[PDB]
Design an enzyme around this catalytic site. Sequence first.
Site, short mmCIF file in Angstrom:
data_model
loop_
_atom_site.label_atom_id
_atom_site.label_comp_id
_atom_site.label_asym_id
_atom_site.label_seq_id
_atom_site.Cartn_x
_atom_site.Cartn_y
_atom_site.Cartn_z
N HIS A 1 -2.68 -6.72 -6.97
CA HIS A 1 -1.49 -6.46 -6.14
C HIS A 1 -0.77 -7.75 -5.74
O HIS A 1 -1.29 -8.83 -5.70
CB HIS A 1 -2.00 -5.83 -4.81
CG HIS A 1 -2.84 -4.61 -5.04
ND1 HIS A 1 -3.97 -4.36 -4.28
CD2 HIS A 1 -2.73 -3.59 -5.93
CE1 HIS A 1 -4.50 -3.22 -4.68
NE2 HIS A 1 -3.78 -2.73 -5.69
N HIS B 1 0.00 -5.34 1.38
CA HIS B 1 0.84 -5.35 0.14
C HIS B 1 2.32 -5.52 0.51
O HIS B 1 2.82 -5.07 1.54
CB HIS B 1 0.68 -3.94 -0.50
CG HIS B 1 -0.68 -3.79 -1.12
ND1 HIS B 1 -1.14 -2.68 -1.72
CD2 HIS B 1 -1.69 -4.72 -1.21
CE1 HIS B 1 -2.36 -2.86 -2.20
NE2 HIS B 1 -2.70 -4.10 -1.87
N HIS C 1 -8.63 -7.69 -6.65
CA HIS C 1 -9.66 -7.17 -5.70
C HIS C 1 -11.00 -7.01 -6.43
O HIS C 1 -11.09 -7.11 -7.65
CB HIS C 1 -9.19 -5.74 -5.28
CG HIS C 1 -8.16 -5.77 -4.19
ND1 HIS C 1 -8.47 -5.81 -2.85
CD2 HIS C 1 -6.80 -5.69 -4.28
CE1 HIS C 1 -7.33 -5.73 -2.14
NE2 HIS C 1 -6.33 -5.71 -3.00
N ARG D 1 -11.31 -9.19 -1.53
CA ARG D 1 -10.32 -9.96 -2.27
C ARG D 1 -11.01 -11.27 -2.72
O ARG D 1 -10.87 -12.26 -2.02
CB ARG D 1 -9.23 -10.41 -1.21
CG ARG D 1 -8.58 -9.20 -0.57
CD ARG D 1 -7.55 -9.67 0.50
NE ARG D 1 -6.98 -8.45 1.14
CZ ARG D 1 -5.94 -8.52 1.96
NH1 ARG D 1 -5.33 -9.70 2.17
NH2 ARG D 1 -5.49 -7.43 2.55
CU LIG Z 1 -4.45 -5.00 -2.39
ZN LIG Z 2 -0.07 -1.03 -2.27
#
Ligand SMILES: [Cu+2]
Ligand SMILES: [Zn+2]
Lengths: 153, 153
Positions: free
Chosen positions: B46, B63, B120, B143
């Site tokens: 992301h 995000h 992740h 993460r």
């Molecule tokens: Cu994420």
């Molecule tokens: Zn998202």
Amino acid sequence: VQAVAVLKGDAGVSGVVKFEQASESEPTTVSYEIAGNSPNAERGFHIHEFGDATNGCVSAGPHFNPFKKTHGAPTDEVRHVGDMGNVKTDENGVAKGSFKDSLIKLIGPTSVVGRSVVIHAGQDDLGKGDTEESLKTGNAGPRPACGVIGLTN
Amino acid sequence: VQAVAVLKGDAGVSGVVKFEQASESEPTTVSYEIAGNSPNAERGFHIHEFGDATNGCVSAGPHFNPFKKTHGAPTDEVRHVGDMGNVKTDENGVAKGSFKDSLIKLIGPTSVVGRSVVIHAGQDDLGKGDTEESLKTGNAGPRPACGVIGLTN
Ligand SMILES: [Cu+2]
Ligand SMILES: [Zn+2]
Ligand SMILES: [Cu+2]
Ligand SMILES: [Zn+2]
């Protein structure tokens, strides 16, 4: 707008540089704390064109210079936008301080978000030396640490 | 415009993600090569709001979601701008690939330059799970690595 760069490298120098600029015409305040330098010295501190860390601090490229001027001191009329002069280190090798600059910006076409900050291992001669090198980098030497400037809140 | 993020962390995962967008309306091409993951798995990938690395990948924040939507798959009409779905790793734990996306941009008000990319340690459930968590992060877990997206040539 606020931005931050975390300086890292393999030479024992590391640090954090924070930028804040309330709006377009306001100058930007730059605050830094960088450790692991030689003690009681002056070291070149610049903003380089690219925020590319794929090859150490080498891929940061040259100083950020959209107006195609030669290198200089932060207070000269002729300087790169990226030229922040030298930071002074204390007896423990720490450089800590803050200053305001009217050419570096976080907003607009010359924003330095996404570019890099580099702390060098030598003193910047402020474009006062006698080589073509002085007019490019200040003869500031190697680049022990650098970091990409990213947005923060 | 081209940009790059070098993903680093202390968990053995590292990698490089390159972005290119010729102009405003063109979609952006994202290409990545990330190693050190679990093998034969799917992992959440992301773009997070801030390019702040002062606290590991934690300070990257949530995000990137300027339009205040819930989390989803890259192909859903309702997703965060930052949602790039899962990348698949091979038998050696490497994820390598490229794709084009029309919401992620390097130019304009929603530019992701100066923000971060995060890989992740878990699979993104694409907002299809049954918790409020699914609608925020895809329940993708920790993460292990992240990097700020910087400009390059
Ligand atoms: Cu994420
Ligand atoms: Zn998202
Ligand atoms: Cu320099
Ligand atoms: Zn310069």
